[model samples]
Target: YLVEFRAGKMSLKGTTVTPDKRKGLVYIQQTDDSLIHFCWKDRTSGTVEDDLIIFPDDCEFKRVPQCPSGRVYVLKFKAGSKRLFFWMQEPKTDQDEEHCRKVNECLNN
Candidate 1:
């Protein structure tokens, strides 16, 4: 799936990488506001909530493409106590280029 963010909201479900290399299910979301939120799937919480740390409105985030037999995309963000990386098993992504472009447009116009 593409990482495009519309004017109001962007929500994505993927795996999160831990320091020990343990991967867990996670959800990333952002509203009209500046801060971005995250949630881990908790068996006890019943419903996953965005209880994790917050990323600033202008945090350093990127979509990098790694090519092998095919290509894979990664979403990397650096603005927290720990860096976050996400890999999705999907083909053909925007690499967040145009999405990021359109987003910054709001600031210009």
Candidate 2:
């Protein structure tokens, strides 16, 4: 599924890397029963900027408040010594919202 989101390496200030942060599709595919391959790709160029295999218990998900906007969510995970974040806006449709909910539940557990 093509879910819109922004993703990049995180900084100490809790912001994403300026150069790496771009609006893109958050790609997630389950290969094994317990492993999911995750990716973030450029929306225009369709170039993947980040990719990794993540287990359900290897990350944290949180709903963050943003001013005067759609719902915001952040997924935090560690890649080596670096921290990464997936910044997701609220899904524009009911099915997308349910999809996001399922993803969050899967990653958080």
* CA lDDT of every candidate: 0.37, 0.54
Model 2 residue 18 lDDT? 35
Poorly placed runs, candidate 1 (over 4 Å)? 1-26, 29-36, 40-51, 55-58, 65-81, 94-109
Clashing pairs in 2: none
- Locate the minimum summed-lDDT window of 10 residues in model 1: 1-10
Q: Candidate 2's error at 1, in angstroms?
A: 5.3
Best of the candidates, lDDT: 2
Distance from true position, residue 38, model 2, in Å?
A: 1.7
True lDDT of residue 107, candidate 2: 57
**lDDT for each residue of candidate 1 in 1-109, tens digit (9 for 90 to 100):** 1123311112334563332222333444555675455543433334553244443453333444453422222333443434444433223444345544433343222
